[PDB]
């Protein structure tokens, strides 16, 4: 298959640059073109630029200045350098191949979150939800983390069905974030229920066990 | 710089009826080769964005065949003949013709279902953050239909603003459901002062507000 592999950092200093790495496998860049394209809540969906298959570049305007796209062809490599970053150059940056004509190599990476920020990385507080005194709701509180991302699982993955881990907001400059899981009631405390955080910025990784009262 | 207008920017449908999504250009975007690349993507809540239809009209690999597009000029149209489940998410027109690349607002597909009750919870501050000295009270708000809920918090019966934090999950695949949390952030000291803690939400299925609370 057609993968675009990204690396890159996750927190960039206000006027830092940022560098991203794509490593294309399935298709030849001596053939065909590579976009960047990157998405903000602020400002929707980017257009970047462009590498071409013999080299050549088309920058849009509004970044020209401070963008550079190169690559190489035999590593299967582009090298994505955007300078002088500001808080609201925060946001997912892809690679992709895009606007074909006769092929079929139509891929995106998976993105690289980006946070502009001069806020410290800290790990999260992670504390465990049980009820107070059919179906019966536990949870996981998530606090005061940063940046962006963690993963919550619960049991490892076999709890799925009835998870719901909400979206991160900002609280006295850092995230909260919760997951909930939904299990019988005549299952807990009987089968065990645990939820698995981790915070890769931070080297954090906890197992919290619900346990009642 | 090629505008591209995309409406509408919310569309809700029923399962298995038709969509339609519409994207003008401010331009004709014919680029220097002859081709018209004008695209549309599906992007899903959590994932990158998928190409479905190239060059204006052509399904791209692996594209069900209920996706069709069309149009000229400055008027292009994404076609859903019969909506399903997993089409939901934010559907983007893009043009590559004219440097720089641009792409349409979004247009977010939303599945209508019958209205579904939220199944609220309330949780006390853990034993471990109470120990730290802070205070949180969750209350999860979960699979309702539709998405628009109000939630509110009394301490003792005062209105609380201050460190009330709400978050929304996207529509779920699975029951086209919203589901919401929202934490109350208290120092373990104020915490301490009051007894009575209530999580109360308002919904369409509901003309009575839906009140969850517990004592410390
Ligand atoms: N009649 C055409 C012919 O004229 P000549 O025989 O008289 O020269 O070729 C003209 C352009 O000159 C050729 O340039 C290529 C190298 O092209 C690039 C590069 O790869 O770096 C890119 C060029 O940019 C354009 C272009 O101006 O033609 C416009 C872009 O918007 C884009 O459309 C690109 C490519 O065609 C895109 O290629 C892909 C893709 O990435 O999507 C991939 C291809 O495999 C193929 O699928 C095509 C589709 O067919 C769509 O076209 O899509 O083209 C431009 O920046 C040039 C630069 O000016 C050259 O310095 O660089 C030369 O090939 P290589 O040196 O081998 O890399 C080629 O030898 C040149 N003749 C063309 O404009 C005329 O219409
Ligand atoms: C926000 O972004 C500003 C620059 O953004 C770009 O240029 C401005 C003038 C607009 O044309 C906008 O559409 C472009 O995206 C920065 O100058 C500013 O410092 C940034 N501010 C923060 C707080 O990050
Ligand atoms: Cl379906």
Same mark, same amino acid.
């Given at each position: 298959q ?8 996750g927190?960039?200093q206000?006027?830092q640059?940022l ?26 969906? $980017? ?5 071409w ?27 994505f350098?955007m ?6 150059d925060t946001?997912?940056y892809?690679c992709?191949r !895009?606007?074909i004509?006769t ?7 998976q ?10 990385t800290?790990?999260?507080?992670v504390?465990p ?5 059919? !179906?019966?709701?536990?949870?996981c ?10 993963t919550?699982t ?6 799925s ?14 995230y909260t974030?919760?997951?909930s899981?939904?299990v019988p ?5 009987? $089968? ?8 890769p910025?931070?080297?954090?990784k ?8 | 710089?090629?505008? !591209?207008?995309?409406s ?7 399962l ?5 999504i ?5 331009q004709?975007?014919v680029?220097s080769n002859?081709?018209?690349?004008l ?10 964005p998928?190409?479905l239809?190239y ?6 690999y692996?594209v069900?065949?209920?996706?069709? &597009?069309? &149009?000229?000029?400055?008027?292009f ?8 489940? $997993? ?16 792409? &349409?607002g979004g247009?977010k ?7 579904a009750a939220?199944t609220?919870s309330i ?11 802070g ?8 699979n ?8 509110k918090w ?6 609380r ?6 978050s929304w999950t996207?529509?779920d695949?699975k029951d086209?459901?919203?589901? !919401?949390?929202?934490?109350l ?9 009051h007894?009575?803690?209530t ?6 299925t ?10 410390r």
């Amino acid at each position: 298959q057609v993968q675009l592999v990204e690396s890159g950092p996750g927190l960039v200093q206000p006027s830092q640059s940022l560098s991203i790495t794509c490593t294309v496998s399935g298709f030849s860049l001596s053939t065909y073109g590579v976009h960047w394209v990157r998405q903000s809540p602020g400002k929707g969906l $980017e257009w970047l630029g462009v590498i071409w298959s013999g080299g050549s570049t088309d920058y849009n305007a509004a970044f020209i200045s401070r963008l550079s796209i190169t690559k190489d062809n035999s590593k299967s490599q582009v090298f994505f350098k955007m300078n002088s970053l500001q808080p609201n150059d925060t946001a997912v940056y892809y690679c992709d191949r !895009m606007r074909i004509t006769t092929d079929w190599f139509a891929y995106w990476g998976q993105g690289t979150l980006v946070t502009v920020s001069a806020a410290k990385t800290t790990p999260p507080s992670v504390y465990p939800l049980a009820p107070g005194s059919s !179906m019966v709701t536990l949870g996981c509180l998530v606090k005061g983390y940063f940046p962006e991302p963690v993963t919550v699982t619960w049991n490892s993955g076999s709890l799925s069905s009835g998870v719901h881990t909400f979206p991160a907001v900002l609280q006295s400059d850092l995230y909260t974030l919760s997951s909930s899981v939904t299990v019988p009631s005549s299952t807990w405390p009987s $089968e065990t229920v645990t939820c698995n955080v981790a915070h890769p910025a931070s080297s954090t990784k906890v197992d919290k066990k619900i346990v009642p009262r | 710089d090629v505008l !591209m207008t995309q409406s509408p920017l919310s569309l809700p449908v029923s399962l298995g009826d038709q969509a339609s999504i519409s994207c003008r250009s401010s331009q004709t975007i014919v680029h220097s080769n002859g081709n018209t690349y004008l695209e549309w993507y599906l992007q899903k809540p959590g994932q990158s964005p998928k190409l479905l239809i190239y060059k204006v009209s052509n399904r791209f690999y692996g594209v069900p065949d209920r996706f069709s &597009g069309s &149009g000229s000029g400055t008027d292009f149209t994404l076609k859903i003949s019969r909506v399903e489940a $997993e089409d939901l998410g934010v559907y983007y027109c893009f043009q590559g013709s004219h440097v720089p690349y641009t792409f &349409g607002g979004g247009t977010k597909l939303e599945i209508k279902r019958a209205d579904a009750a939220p199944t609220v919870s309330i949780f006390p501050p853990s034993s471990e953050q109470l120990t730290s000295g802070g205070a949180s009270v969750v209350c999860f708000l979960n699979n309702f239909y539709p998405k628009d809920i109000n939630v509110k918090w009394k301490i003792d019966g005062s209105e609380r603003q201050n460190g009330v934090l709400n978050s929304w999950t996207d529509q779920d695949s699975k029951d086209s459901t919203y589901s !919401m949390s929202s934490t109350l952030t208290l120092t373990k000291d104020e915490y301490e002062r009051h007894n009575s803690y209530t999580c109360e939400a308002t919904h369409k299925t509901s003309t009575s507000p839906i009140v969850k609370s517990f004592n410390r």
